[PDB]
Amino acid sequence: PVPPLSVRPAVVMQGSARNQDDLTHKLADIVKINNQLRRNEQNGAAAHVIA
């Protein structure tokens, strides 16, 4: 379960740079590796790579 935006608000700094929450960065890592694992299982990858 990925929480809503209220639990991880993207606070705007003095300028326009929108800083993301720690939860959002972590979910970014999770989605990155999840997509990476999904393609590695779908396409050519070694068993140790998938592991």
Partner 1 sequence: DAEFDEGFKVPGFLFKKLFKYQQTGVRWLWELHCQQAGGILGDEMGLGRTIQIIAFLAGLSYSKIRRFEGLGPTVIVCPTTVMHQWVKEFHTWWPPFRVAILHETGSYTHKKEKLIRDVAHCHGILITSYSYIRLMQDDISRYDWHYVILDEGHKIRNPNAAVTLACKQFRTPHRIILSGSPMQNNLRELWSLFDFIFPGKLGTLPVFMEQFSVPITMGGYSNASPVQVKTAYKCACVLRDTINPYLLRRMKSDVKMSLSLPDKNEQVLFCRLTDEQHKVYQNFVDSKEVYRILNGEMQIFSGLIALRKICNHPDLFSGEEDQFGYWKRSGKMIVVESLLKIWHKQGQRVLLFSQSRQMLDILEVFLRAQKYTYLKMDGTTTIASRQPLITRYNEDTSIFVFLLTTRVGGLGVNLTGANRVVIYDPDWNPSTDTQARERAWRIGQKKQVTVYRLLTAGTIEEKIYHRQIFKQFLTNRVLKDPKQRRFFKSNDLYELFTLTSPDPLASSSLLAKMRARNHL
Chain residues binding partner 1 by CB under 8 A are 41-47
Region near DNA per CB under 7 A, out of 1-9, 11-19, 41-49: 11-19
| Residue 5 one-letter amino acid | L
20 to 49: interface string for DNA, x by CB under 7 A: x-------x---x-----------------
Residue 44 contact partner, candidates partner 1, DNA, none, CB within 5 to 8 A by sort of partner: partner 1
Count of other CB atoms within 10 angstroms of residue 24: 16
CA–CA gap between residue 16 and residue 39 (Å, rounded):
35
Across the strands, what pairs with 11? 19
